[PDB]
């Protein structure tokens, strides 16, 4: 059996899209082990095995410890990701030494991954969460910022191999800026993984009754973001459709009673939901976006520029459109459900995604590389 060590960022959304691959390898009769922290339990809930490389560590404190200030760039974030990776290094190394992998899989911001691969002279595989996760020269910079961590464990090497995986289909890829394109990367089909579930009664869709998923995302929902959707839900009663709202932690009490045609659930796997849905309104999460694409379903994105890159994609491909929360209502919903061009394009991209090699295939490719 080949042995694959998955060294990931502690965050749920970085972990989840690695599961298909891990799962795929186990399916080939090989061995998979994770080496992470934070939202590690998600690995266990996926039928896989994980080692906690940073027990007790408070990540929040770690992440967070200008007119004139320099270094308002990638360097700030590289530094930040280095501090977070730092607390995984020792753990990752002990595990790698005892468990002895043939291959390191890592996520782009997890600096412990290439460090470990370099230390043990193994190849590494970069597995990104999606299009957003393609910050230019991020990896090289994280490495630099971790110099002190490399030098302490006596690591002068570069890992053996450096494969980059991509789950982004070619047409989406084309619409990204040149410096965010990853050419020569191994394409792998995006296979939604959102968690396993005992599915509810109501999931199977009623006869001739259309359905719109509304998702806040696992993150922005707890900020106080449910408020955002108040205008929407003040007009949905007028819409000849069923709405499914996933809270993902958000406070219901912020708006309270919703119309009869709105169903509320805390969590449900997105892939499973969209299988039965006609359209989706969301926040612009990468995982949510790719999942929706995969489902071949029109999309509406409530943008928000605290920082997105997802406007030009939906527009460019013609699978969807953007809409400000304050001006979001029945009309957008109608457009989602009736606009033929949105559906065909959605379907078009889905087809493209299904032509990309599945994770099973990608796994076979790696097994030999190791």
Ligand X SMILES: O=c1ccn([C@H]2C[C@H](O)[C@@H](COP(=O)(O)OP(=O)(O)O)O2)c(=O)[nH]1
* Binding residues for a copy of itself (CB under 8 A): 1, 19-20, 23-24, 26-29, 33, 40-41, 43-52, 94-95, 98-99, 189, 191, 193, 195-199, 204, 269, 272, 354, 358-360, 363-364
DSSP-derived pairing of the beta strands 262-265 and 320-322? unpaired
Closer CB to ligand X, 203 or 369, in the complex = 203
Closer CB to ligand X, 197 or 237, in the complex = 197
Choosing among a copy of itself, ligand X, none, which partner's interface includes residue 204 (Cβ < 5 to 8 Å by kind)? a copy of itself
> Distance (Å, rounded) from C-alpha 223 to C-alpha 237?
26
- Burial grade of 11 (CB within 10 A; 0-12, 13-18, 19 or more): buried
Choosing among a copy of itself, ligand X, none, which partner's interface includes residue 115 (Cβ < 5 to 8 Å by kind)? none
Interacting residues of 144 by C-beta distance below 8 A, sequence separation 6+: 78
What does the buried/exposed string (b/e) look like for 58-97 if buried means 16 or more CB atoms within 10 Å of the residue's CB? ebeebeeeeeeeeeeebeeebbbbbebbbbbbebbbebbe
302 is in an annotated binding site: no
Counting every residue written for the chain, the total comes to 370
Question: Does 229 contact ligand X by CB under 6 A?
Answer: no
> Given the rule CB under 6 A, which of 91-99, 117-125, 261-269, 314-322 is the region that contacts ligand X?
261-269
219 is in an annotated binding site: yes
Choosing among ligand X, a copy of itself, none, which partner's interface includes residue 248 (Cβ < 5 to 8 Å by kind)? ligand X
Joined together, the tokens standing for residue 91 give: 């753990």
Applying CB under 6 A, what is the total number of residues that bind ligand X? 19
Question: Does 310 contact ligand X by CB under 6 A?
Answer: no
- 254: helix, coil or strand? helix
Closer CB to a copy of itself, 333 or 363, in the complex = 363
Sign of the alpha-carbon dihedral angle for 184, 134, 176, 299: positive
Backbone angles phi, psi at 244, to 5 degrees: -110, 110
Question: Does 268 contact ligand X by CB under 6 A?
Answer: yes
Question: Does 8 contact ligand X by CB under 6 A?
Answer: no
When binding is defined by CB under 6 A, the residue of 109, 134, 215, 310 that contacts ligand X is 215
- Burial grade of 204 (CB within 10 A; 0-12, 13-18, 19 or more): exposed
What residues form DSSP beta bridges with 265?
246
Q: List residues binding ligand X (CB under 6 A).
A: 13, 16, 194, 215, 217-220, 246, 248, 267-270, 285-288, 291
Binding-site annotation, residues for dUDP: 194, 218-219, 267-268, 270, 283, 287-288
């Amino acid at each position: 059996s080949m042995r694959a060590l998955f060294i990931t960022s502690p965050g749920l959304s970085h972990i989840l899209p690695t599961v298909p691959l891990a799962q795929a390898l186990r399916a080939l009769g090989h061995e998979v082990r994770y080496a992470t922290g934070g939202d590690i339990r998600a690995v266990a809930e996926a039928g896989l095995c994980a080692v906690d490389v940073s027990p007790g560590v408070n990540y929040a404190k770690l992440f967070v410890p200008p007119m004139h200030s320099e270094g308002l760039g990638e360097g700030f974030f590289a530094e930040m990701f280095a501090r977070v990776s730092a607390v995984a290094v020792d753990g990752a190394l002990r595990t790698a030494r005892s468990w002895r992998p043939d291959l390191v899989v890592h996520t782009p911001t997890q600096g412990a991954g290439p460090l470990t691969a370099a230390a043990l002279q193994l190849p590494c595989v970069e597995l990104p969460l999606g299009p957003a996760d393609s910050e230019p020269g991020l990896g090289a910079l994280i490495r630099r910022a971790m110099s002190k961590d490399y030098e302490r464990h006596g690591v002068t090497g570069e890992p053996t191999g450096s494969v980059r995986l991509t789950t982004t289909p070619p047409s989406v890829e084309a619409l990204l800026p040149e410096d965010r394109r990853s050419p020569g990367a191994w394409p792998m089909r995006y296979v939604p993984y959102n968690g396993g579930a005992v599915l509810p009664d109501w999931l199977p869709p009623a006869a001739g009754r259309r359905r719109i998923a509304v998702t806040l995302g696992s993150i922005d929902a707890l900020s106080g973001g449910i408020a955002k959707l108040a205008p929407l839900f003040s007009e949905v009663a007028d819409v000849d459709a069923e709405f499914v709202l996933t809270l993902g932690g958000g406070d219901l009490a912020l708006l309270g009673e919703l119309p009869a045609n709105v169903r509320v659930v805390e969590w449900i796997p997105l892939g499973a939901l969209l299988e039965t849905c006609d359209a989706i309104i969301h926040h612009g999460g990468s995982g949510t976006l790719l999942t929706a694409l995969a489902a071949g379903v029109p999309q509406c994105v409530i943008p928000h520029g605290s920082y997105d890159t997802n406007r030009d994609v939906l527009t460019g491909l013609g699978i969807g459109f953007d809409a400000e929360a304050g001006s979001l209502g029945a009309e957008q919903c109608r457009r989602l459900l009736d606009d033929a061009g949105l559906r065909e394009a959605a379907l078009r991209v889905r087809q493209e995604m299904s032509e990309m090699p599945p994770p099973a295939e990608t796994a076979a490719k790696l097994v030999a590389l190791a």
